[PDB]
Amino acid sequence: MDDKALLVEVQLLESKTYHALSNLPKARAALTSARTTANAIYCPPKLQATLD
Amino acid sequence: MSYDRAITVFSPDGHLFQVEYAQEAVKKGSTAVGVRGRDIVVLGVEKKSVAKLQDERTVRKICALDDNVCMAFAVVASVSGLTADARIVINRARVECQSHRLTVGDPVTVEYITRYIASLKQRYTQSNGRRPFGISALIVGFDFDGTPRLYQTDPSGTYHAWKANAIGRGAKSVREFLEKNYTDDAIETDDLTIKLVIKALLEVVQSGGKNIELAVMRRDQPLKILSPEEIEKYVAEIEKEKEENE
Amino acid sequence: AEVKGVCTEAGMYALRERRVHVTQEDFEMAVAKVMQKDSEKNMSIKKLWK
Amino acid sequence: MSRRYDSRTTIFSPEGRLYQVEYAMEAIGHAGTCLGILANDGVLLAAERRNIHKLLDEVFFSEKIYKLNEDMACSVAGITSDANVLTNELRLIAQRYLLQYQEPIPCEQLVTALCDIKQAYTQFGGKRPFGVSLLYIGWDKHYGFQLYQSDPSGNYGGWKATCIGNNSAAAVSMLKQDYKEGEMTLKSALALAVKVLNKTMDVSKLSAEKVEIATLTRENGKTVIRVLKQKEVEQLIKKHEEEEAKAER
Amino acid sequence: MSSIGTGYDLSASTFSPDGRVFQVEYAMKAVENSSTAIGIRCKDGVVFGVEKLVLSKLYEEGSNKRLFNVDRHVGMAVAGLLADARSLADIAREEASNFRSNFGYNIPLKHLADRVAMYVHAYTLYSAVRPFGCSFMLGSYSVNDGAQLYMIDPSGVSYGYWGCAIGKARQAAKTEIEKLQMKEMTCRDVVKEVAKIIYIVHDEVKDKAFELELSWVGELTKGRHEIVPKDVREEAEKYAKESLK
Amino acid sequence: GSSRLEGGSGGDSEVQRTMLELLNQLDGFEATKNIKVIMATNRIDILDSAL
Amino acid sequence: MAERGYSFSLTTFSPSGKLVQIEYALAAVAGGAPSVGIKAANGVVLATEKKQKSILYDERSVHKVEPITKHIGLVYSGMGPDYRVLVHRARKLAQQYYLVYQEPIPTAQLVQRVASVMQEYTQSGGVRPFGVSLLICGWNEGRPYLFQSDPSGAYFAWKATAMGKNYVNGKTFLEKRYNEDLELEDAIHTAILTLKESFEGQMTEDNIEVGICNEAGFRRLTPTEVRDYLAAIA
Amino acid sequence: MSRGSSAGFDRHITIFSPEGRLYQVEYAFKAINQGGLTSVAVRGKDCAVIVTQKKVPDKLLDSSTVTHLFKITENIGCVMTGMTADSRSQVQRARYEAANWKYKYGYEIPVDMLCKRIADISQVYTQNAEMRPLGCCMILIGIDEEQGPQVYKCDPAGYYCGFKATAAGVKQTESTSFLEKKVKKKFDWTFEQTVETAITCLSTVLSIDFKPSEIEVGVVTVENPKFRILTEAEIDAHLVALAERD
Amino acid sequence: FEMARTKKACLIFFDEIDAIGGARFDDGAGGDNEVQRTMLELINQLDGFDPRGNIKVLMATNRPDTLDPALMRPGRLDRKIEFSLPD
């Protein structure tokens, strides 16, 4: 399922964690991945605000 | 019923439209020839459009109304077989033949069937929201007498007896060649009558024994529809006779 | 038209990220954005352009 | 009022055709491949299954393979709508004949009863003709194995091999080219039918979701009517598919 | 519109975006063409006054009459086309006759009026037939239901009136009723009034010439619908003539 | 022009059918042709008898 | 009370070879309320929008979601009056069957019966076809069943289907959200989501009706139960 | 073509348009507006109420037998809005069916059974191209046994549905939206309260401002088994309270 | 019509009006407007407040079914004669 807000949320949380470890390629890759699934117009305004 | 919308309404030309539309559809094609013999009457249609992959045994374009009455039909278009249209006339005529034989102990004559065709076309005319069939039928059969007869009907419902007639693709052209072939010997010898039907069919377009189907009736005995294998042998023998006279 | 729409959508992303070269990341977001247009074309059973 | 609205499509044309039957004739052609081939131990029908999704219930045996009797089966080319009323009526007629005669009904006897009804609509009444043309397959005692085709006014023709639907000219010519009047057995007969369906149809490898093939086979003196299942169909697809592969070389 | 070959006046199943039905309306314009028939409810009966159209010079009484007896105690005055009126007389008389047979009491006008109206209304709905080209009044006296006046138009409405007019002059004629107190008033005095209204309203181009026919159904006739005596007609005629001068 | 199409098999097909007729026989330029008339359509319904 | 009826040709084939009336009837159902049917294989669930756009409608006994008989129900989309006669007619066939067999009519059998009616309306003149698409549900003879019958008189078999506005998107959302070999609970959840993907926005429990079908029977739940479900879905 | 299907048949007879729904059917809803009658019905827990014009136009028209509140039968009564010709016709058909039901079936008739039965009939009329979709709309009151007092309205289109509040007539849309504000700012329905709500909606919308002889109110009460018109006495007592309301 | 009246003896033979003479209606796309226009003009000068001048009129129609009630009454159609299929 990528046609959902919920998938965006996991990917964002993960990108924050790899960043802290200083697993920098991982955090970067995960951050683009969250934005790709965020594009869906099934996501409500708030989810978009947190994503920025 | 609820449908009473006009399909036929009378013309100042002194005709019924459908009947005339039907009559030209037998001018333009589906050669059906019949000759009357002296023991046996034979009718033949050319085209079942056997393209060498179709079945020949079960296809009927000559249908036995009775065991002493048979008809061969024609009317064509782009919708080439109007077998459906025929199939109604065939089923109602079949019961009526049998019915006439239950009531009246004489075997039903072709003259009864011909009046019955004239009334079916007409009845469809008078009834609201209804239209005449396009068929023309060559009604063959045997009377009380046991005399062979060939009668021909038109899409209006007018009938005449005729010794030999051809209809389709120039009714008059096929009949005037065939007119020479109708001689006293030809009508007497039964075998020569079978050839006369086939010999006419060949004038319009030549060859094919599968395209040609003909059914034979002898006395009051049941209809026998001939194998195509019997036809092929017969067209080959007809073609040589043409070279002999000429 | 849709296929070209991938490159075209990519450019919007490169400005946003503030790149000078259209990176791989720009393309990831673009396929998904173009897939949503396709989905709309199909829903409507008519073309998008009018 | 009423006649004016009536487009006079029930009128005869001078040429000797009915406008409606001709317009119905086109409705059959839009629609999918239905072909029947004669074989010498059984007879087979191959019809295009047009119900492909990954969420399908399959509440019916098939939506195009109809078993009309317990000795006849048929396939469809035309419109599903007409096919549903018609298919039911075909069942009462097949079944009543079975009661009286107690022998399998001729394929020819089966097209004719319906024909009256088809003709009735076209000529008068201003009623549409049925949008399907049916290929009936059967075995009856009298002729042995037979295939019959009906058209939108009930015009009938006995055929060894015939095809109606989408790319009807292509399917019938091709089948005419390899096979002419009953040169093959039941085994080979399924492999040609799927092959024809393959070329005609947009998917050029097929699956069992794309094709549905039905057999009617005379075993131990009694007619068995079976819709073959997806499993049996894949075997038949691999046999034709492989035969095509050799052709190229 | 009026010149057309599909729908409008061919049909009546048709609706305009306004909602109108033109055929039912054309039937209404048809009732308008001939002279007026008035029928006035009293608390004791109904009195009719009808113009009876003189269409020739070789007349006899009752010729082209518009006074019918639906039931013994119901009279029916028609206005508009007489062709349609004869068929309507048969249907109304028939519904009443069977009623008397079964129920065994004098047909309530409220019931009879509902049944004929339904019949007119079945035709206005239909595009399969045209609707009647006349409008009629049924008027009656009984002591089992009281004095009742009903009116049925080409549309298929039944509502009770206490004084009604149908025909050409009806908008003028109706006004003269508001002047009169007729709800409470003997049927003897009301005959004098229906006669004077008709004489003044008539003019030589609504119809050439008429014969005055008045009818009783009240305390005087004892609840019988009968035609008025020679005496009654003439005094009511006289009062009409004297008021006309 | 979707209205032209379902109306009687296209007003746009009308223009195509005529141009196709003109192009079938014209002057001495029937022999050589380097001017074609091309149609884009997506239906088979619109197609009249010459097409 | 004098008529013969009219039967006329606008119900015969056009030159295109397709029937003029059927296309228009399919347009009537597209304009309708969206309706999803999902066969769980643990029961059949049917969901529709309760609303008619004014919510001054009493609907505590008037529903869009009606049982035909003990465990077969119809949910519709499209035209309200035409559906009303089809509901009434469908019941009458069910009870006729009920007299003879003792079991209530199968969804497979019932559709053919209904289909004849749809057919008369197309093929004869002076009538017009019904513009209602039907989702027919049942659980009988050991398997739950979902059928579709469109307005022309075709019946199609689906295991998840969507209708009305954005019938196309519903079929794709069903393909995506719902997978095979999931349970009944999962089915109920997915239908309300298909209705979200098929007209979007605000929902109350008087804007939705949900009915569940088992061999226990078809029942349309009370307003409260439907309310709890709403909160689950996004 | 624009401005109706005049080169087409779609407003001439009943058949689906190129746009989906018929012109004719939509047009039937426009015939209601012609009647001049507007009805407002309000559902309570004491009675279900109808308020309609008693209004007479002359001395010559009765008011002792002219009413648009009709007693279909004792428990259930109705109001007709629109065309008067169609209005009577449905009332009689309804009355006969109500007696027949009670006689054969033996079940007492709720609001639903009359409403649904008429609605299915008015579907047949819409469906036939001989008959026309009705010129009137029927708003029924009557006591449902499970629910309580119920107000239903059936469409000339052939649809029935339940209503807590409804309006039909010339100002169909204006009155229903007005009454919507009254539902939203809810009233615990007493006897006097349902009657009051119905009259204020109609008085504001028409902008005549009614008095008690000009309206006639119809109740079917939980202690009245019969249908009764409240007439002027009760209406005036409410009427003054309406001026004091807001 | 004016030109006809001024000259000495005119016969205006209005040739073959089948649908070019048709009864007044409007479709809201163009309507019968243009057709009725000629028709109506001929009515206004003929009857008018001035009568028909020195103008004789002959009408050829195959359809009187189409024509307006104004044309069919006399003052330009005094006698109707059917020249149809012969005896």
From Swiss-Prot, chain A:
Where does it localize? Nucleus; Cytoplasm, Cytosol
Q: Where is the signal peptide?
A: none
Domain of life from the UniProt record: Eukaryota
Post-translational note: Phosphorylated by AMPK.
- What task does this protein carry out? Component of the 26S proteasome, a multiprotein complex involved in the ATP-dependent degradation of ubiquitinated proteins. This complex plays a key role in the maintenance of protein homeostasis by removing misfolded or damaged proteins, which could impair cellular functions, and by removing proteins whose functions are no longer required. Therefore, the proteasome participates in numerous cellular processes, including cell cycle progression, apoptosis, or DNA damage repair. In the complex, PSMD11 is required for proteasome assembly.
Q: Which family does it belong to?
A: Belongs to the proteasome subunit S9 family.
Subunit architecture:
Component of the 19S proteasome regulatory particle complex. The 26S proteasome consists of a 20S core particle (CP) and two 19S regulatory subunits (RP). The regulatory particle is made of a lid composed of 9 subunits including PSMD11, a base containing 6 ATPases and few additional components.
Output this protein's name.
26S proteasome non-ATPase regulatory subunit 11
What organism, scientifically named, is this protein from? Rattus norvegicus (Rat)
* Gene field: Psmd11
UniProtKB/Swiss-Prot annotation, chain D:
Q: What is its main location?
A: cytoplasm
Q: Does the keyword Transmembrane apply?
A: no
Q: Which family does the entry's similarity section mention?
A: Belongs to the peptidase T1A family.
Q: N6-acetyllysine (modified residue): where?
A: 127, 176
Q: How does it assemble?
A: The 26S proteasome consists of a 20S proteasome core and two 19S regulatory subunits. The 20S proteasome core is a barrel-shaped complex made of 28 subunits that are arranged in four stacked rings. The two outer rings are each formed by seven alpha subunits, and the two inner rings are formed by seven beta subunits. The proteolytic activity is exerted by three beta-subunits PSMB5, PSMB6 and PSMB7.
Please give the tissue specificity annotation from the record for this chain: Ubiquitous.
Record CDD domains: proteasome_alpha_type_4 (cd03752)
**InterPro entries, sorted:** Ntn_hydrolases_N (IPR029055), Proteasome_alpha (IPR050115), Proteasome_alpha-type (IPR023332), Proteasome_asu_N (IPR000426), Proteasome_bsu_CS (IPR016050), Proteasome_sua/b (IPR001353)
Q: What functional role does this protein have? A: Component of the 20S core proteasome complex involved in the proteolytic degradation of most intracellular proteins. This complex plays numerous essential roles within the cell by associating with different regulatory particles. Associated with two 19S regulatory particles, forms the 26S proteasome and thus participates in the ATP-dependent degradation of ubiquitinated proteins.
Localisation per UniProt entry: Cytoplasm; Nucleus
**Which Gene Ontology cellular-component terms appear in the entry?**
cytoplasm; cytosol; nucleoplasm; nucleus; P-body; proteasome complex; proteasome core complex; proteasome core complex, alpha-subunit complex
Pfam family membership, one: Proteasome
At the top level of its lineage, which domain of life is listed? Answer: Eukaryota
Does the keyword Nucleus feature in the UniProt annotation? Answer: yes
Curated annotation (Swiss-Prot), chain E:
Question: Which PROSITE patterns would you find in this protein's record?
Answer: PROTEASOME_ALPHA_1, PROTEASOME_ALPHA_2
Compartment(s): Cytoplasm; Nucleus
Q: Which residues carry this modification: N-acetylserine?
A: 2
Key word Hydrolase present: no
Q: Which InterPro entries match?
A: Ntn_hydrolases_N (IPR029055), Proteasome_alpha (IPR050115), Proteasome_alpha-type (IPR023332), Proteasome_asu_N (IPR000426), Proteasome_sua/b (IPR001353)
Its Gene Ontology cellular component terms are: cytoplasm; nucleus; proteasome complex; proteasome core complex; proteasome core complex, alpha-subunit complex
Gene3D superfamilies, per the entry:
Glutamine Phosphoribosylpyrophosphate, subunit 1, domain 1 (3.60.20.10)
* Keyword annotations: Acetylation, Cytoplasm, Nucleus, Phosphoprotein, Proteasome
SMART domains recorded? Proteasome_A_N
Residue numbers bearing the Phosphoserine modification: 243
Write out the similarity annotation: Belongs to the peptidase T1A family.
Q: What is this protein called?
A: Proteasome subunit alpha type-3
Show the taxonomic lineage.
Eukaryota, Metazoa, Chordata, Craniata, Vertebrata
Swiss-Prot record, chain G:
Q: Give the record's keywords alphabetically.
A: Acetylation, Cytoplasm, Nucleus, Phosphoprotein, Proteasome
A cellular-component GO term for this protein: nucleus
Keyword Signal present in the record's keywords: the answer is: no
GO BP term (any one): proteasome-mediated ubiquitin-dependent protein catabolic process
Q: Which SMART domains match?
A: Proteasome_A_N
Report the PROSITE patterns cross-referenced here: PROTEASOME_ALPHA_1, PROTEASOME_ALPHA_2
Q: Which residues carry this modification: N-acetylalanine?
A: 2
UniProt modified residues of type Phosphotyrosine: 6, 24, 76, 121
Q: Where in the cell is it found?
A: Cytoplasm; Nucleus
List residues modified as Phosphoserine: 7, 14, 16
Post-translationally, this protein is described as follows, namely:
Phosphorylated on tyrosine residues; which may be important for nuclear import.
Give residues where N6-acetyllysine occurs: 70, 171
What does the subunit comment say?
The 26S proteasome consists of a 20S proteasome core and two 19S regulatory subunits. The 20S proteasome core is a barrel-shaped complex made of 28 subunits that are arranged in four stacked rings. The two outer rings are each formed by seven alpha subunits, and the two inner rings are formed by seven beta subunits. The proteolytic activity is exerted by three beta-subunits PSMB5, PSMB6 and PSMB7.
Q: Which family does it belong to?
A: Belongs to the peptidase T1A family.
Query: Per its database record, what is this protein's job?
Result: Component of the 20S core proteasome complex involved in the proteolytic degradation of most intracellular proteins. This complex plays numerous essential roles within the cell by associating with different regulatory particles. Associated with two 19S regulatory particles, forms the 26S proteasome and thus participates in the ATP-dependent degradation of ubiquitinated proteins.
The name of this protein is: Proteasome subunit alpha type-2
Native species: Rattus norvegicus
